[PDB]
RNA sequence: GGAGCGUUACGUCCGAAAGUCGCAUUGCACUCCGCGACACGGCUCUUUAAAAACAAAAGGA
RNA sequence: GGAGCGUUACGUCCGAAAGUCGCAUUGCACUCCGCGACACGGCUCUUUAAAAACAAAAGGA
Ligand SMILES: NC(=O)c1ccc[n+]([C@@H]2O[C@H](COP(=O)([O-])OP(=O)(O)OC[C@H]3O[C@@H](n4cnc5c(N)ncnc54)[C@H](O)[C@@H]3O)[C@@H](O)[C@H]2O)c1
Ligand SMILES: NC(=O)c1ccc[n+]([C@@H]2O[C@H](COP(=O)([O-])OP(=O)(O)OC[C@H]3O[C@@H](n4cnc5c(N)ncnc54)[C@H](O)[C@@H]3O)[C@@H](O)[C@H]2O)c1
Ligand SMILES: [Mg+2]
Ligand SMILES: [Mg+2]
Ligand SMILES: [Mg+2]
Ligand SMILES: [Mg+2]
């Protein structure tokens with residue numbers, strides 16, 4: 001089920017929005033160009049982040065290489081997104 | 091009882107709310123009496139015999155008189171102060 | 187963005203301001219003349235400090251040498267400071 | 279044939295900046311040495327025999343060894359510390375009288 | 376428990392051995408011939424002593440007679456010696 | 468059961484102190500003293516007071 | 529009313545506005561959005577932001 005966009009959860013919910021975005025960007029940029037990182041602190045979406053890679057190539061490599069990577073004292077759980085993100089489908 | 095009416099360097103106060111703690115009491119007495127003269131000492135004990143009462147020692151008898159007459163019946167912690175002269179000199183005053 | 191001043195954080199927040207300043211001078215003086223050390227225990231400054239050097243050269247060496255240096259049992263994190271405006275703000 | 283220096287849970291520090299007040303010196307020493315383990319005392323004096331010198335008394339000997347080895351020559355108030363194991367408890371007392 | 380040797384403790388540890396031994400001999404000879412007195416200021420024996428009587432009856436008397444006696448400002452605690460192996464072990 | 472150990476709250480001083488609640492008290496001191504009541508994990512020893520450690524989810528200031 | 533002032537509990541530090549704490553939440557989105565809590569005597573000035581004094585019957589470590 002690969003996809004340009006990986007779904008990360010089990011993230012530390014105490015981290016401020018833009019710090020979290022920066023810290024994810026630094027730790028996932030190696031894998032390729034990141035189009036965007038979507039983070040929301042609502043009840044429904046805290047602890048979660050969508051990283052949008054330019055290439056599925058980068059996303060797949062990011063998923064297994066960083067699966068369980070320790071991040072703000074919690075191992076991050078990474079799957080592919082179940083749909084396409086807006087930017088990837090426009 | 092007949093209040094002590096001999097002018098004296100020290101005024102004897104009673105009918106004081108004895109729920110107040112020593113240091114608060116002394117400190118609040120010094121605030122409301124400092125404008126009458128130099129105060130040499132304020133004596134407060136919470137023992138059985140001495141609670142509800144305070145001694146305020148002025149350097150000059152005139153200060154005590156004006157203090158007594160101005161502050162008589164003053165509401166102090168919801169009780170009106172009763173102020174007399176001390177029946178005897180305080181020791182710092184007898185020394186002198 | 188290198189400049190005269192380093193921003194240190196992950197400092198042990200249970201140390202008194204006067205002692206924390208003298209202890210920081212003790213280890214950072216080797217790098218250059220310290221113009222000032224800014225510490226406060228306010229909610230905005232607690233666990234953080236600014237050290238201001240006469241020369242930018244000193245701040246840069248201080249940053250790289252003392253990165254992670256354990257200090258009051260905590261490895262300190264060092265960055266270049268932002269603008270004087272940002273400093274004045276976090277100190278009020 | 280050359281013998282290892284005998285470990286001690288107390289380290290002897292010298293080449294210290296003599297311009298620092300003793301009280302501050304103690305607290306600054308604590309700040310850089312507490313990382314190696316529990317400190318029981320730091321010994322400094324204004325007396326003339328203790329000039330530019332200090333003892334840091336650790337609970338465990340392993341602490342003193344790690345502290346000596348890691349901080350040997352560490353620049354402290356613009357002066358590299360010289361660190362060695364303390365010799366004996368009598369010697370510490372004589373130096374502190 | 377009746378032994379010809381008694382074990383004393385709560386002795387002041389700053390008295391030097393010979394002195395402690397002769398002082399002990401004076402206050403105990405009156406009960407019977409003392410064959411020997413064992414003192415040492417090692418970790419195992421500082422503050423304590425064994426007194427070796429020729430006869431058990433000498434040691435039973437000294438037990439109760441001299442119990443709690445004040446000695447260099449401290450009350451003596453006297454007991455029978457448990458075993459000859461304990462005595463020899465304490466003195467090694 | 469009993470006793471010793473007062474180490475610990477930010478981190479100090481206390482815990483035979485202190486604060487609080489309830490009575491009682493209108494009282495002339497210079498030194499201070501009316502009752503009564505109201506917390507504490509754990510360690511050690513066993514009518515003995517020694518030893519060496521130790522908690523803020525347990526009391527005061 | 530407004531603004532500035534953070535001095536005070538044993539006696540030290542702290543004392544919101546885009547921040548903090550507590551509880552709940554493992555949730556697949558691309559138009560904000562769970563619930564609860566954040567005390568405080570007084571002083572000074574009058575849209576200025578300065579000045580120099582100050583409380584534990586008022587919050588936190
Ligand atoms: N860890 C420690 O070092 C330590 C030390 C003391 C107390 N504590 C804690 O305190 C609790 C109670 O202390 P305790 O175990 O000593 O019990 P406790 O204080 O009741 O015992 C004290 C002893 O002194 C006597 N006593 C009682 N009141 C007295 C008074 N006003 N004046 C003189 N003597 C009096 C009692 O008869 C008792 O034998 C313990 O359970 C423990 O939690 C801990
Ligand atoms: N003596 C002094 O030097 C001094 C100085 C400052 C404060 N104080 C004390 O503090 C009290 C309050 O200080 P102030 O008058 O400067 O208060 P303030 O100007 O901080 O505002 C008062 C109240 O507004 C509330 N508040 C803050 N941010 C908020 C937000 N985003 N949304 C809703 N409410 C918010 C806070 O609860 C605060 O207590 C004073 O009455 C005084 O008792 C004393
Ligand atoms: Mg009032
Ligand atoms: Mg019990
Ligand atoms: Mg008990
Ligand atoms: Mg006790």
Ligand SMILES: [Mg+2]
Nearest residue numbers: 200476477478
């Ligand atoms: Mg603490």
Ligand SMILES: [Mg+2]
Nearest residue numbers: 482483484485
């Ligand atoms: Mg009592």
Ligand SMILES: [Mg+2]
Nearest residue numbers: 504505506526
């Ligand atoms: Mg009680």
Ligand SMILES: [Mg+2]
Nearest residue numbers: 507508509510
């Ligand atoms: Mg107990």
Ligand SMILES: [Mg+2]
Nearest residue numbers: 508509521522
């Ligand atoms: Mg425990």
Ligand SMILES: [Mg+2]
Nearest residue numbers: 505506526527
């Ligand atoms: Mg109580």
Ligand SMILES: [Mg+2]
Nearest residue numbers: 485527528538
């Ligand atoms: Mg108090």
Ligand SMILES: [Mg+2]
Nearest residue numbers: 529530573574
């Ligand atoms: Mg008005």
Ligand SMILES: [Mg+2]
Nearest residue numbers: 534541542543
């Ligand atoms: Mg403040």
Ligand SMILES: [Mg+2]
Nearest residue numbers: 479480538539
């Ligand atoms: Mg204190």
Ligand SMILES: [Mg+2]
Nearest residue numbers: 113537538539
């Ligand atoms: Mg006070």
Ligand SMILES: [Mg+2]
Nearest residue numbers: 546559560561
């Ligand atoms: Mg809104």
Ligand SMILES: [Mg+2]
Nearest residue numbers: 562563564565
């Ligand atoms: Mg909210």
Ligand SMILES: [Mg+2]
Nearest residue numbers: 543566587588
């Ligand atoms: Mg608060």
Ligand SMILES: [Mg+2]
Nearest residue numbers: 199200477589
């Ligand atoms: Mg805290």
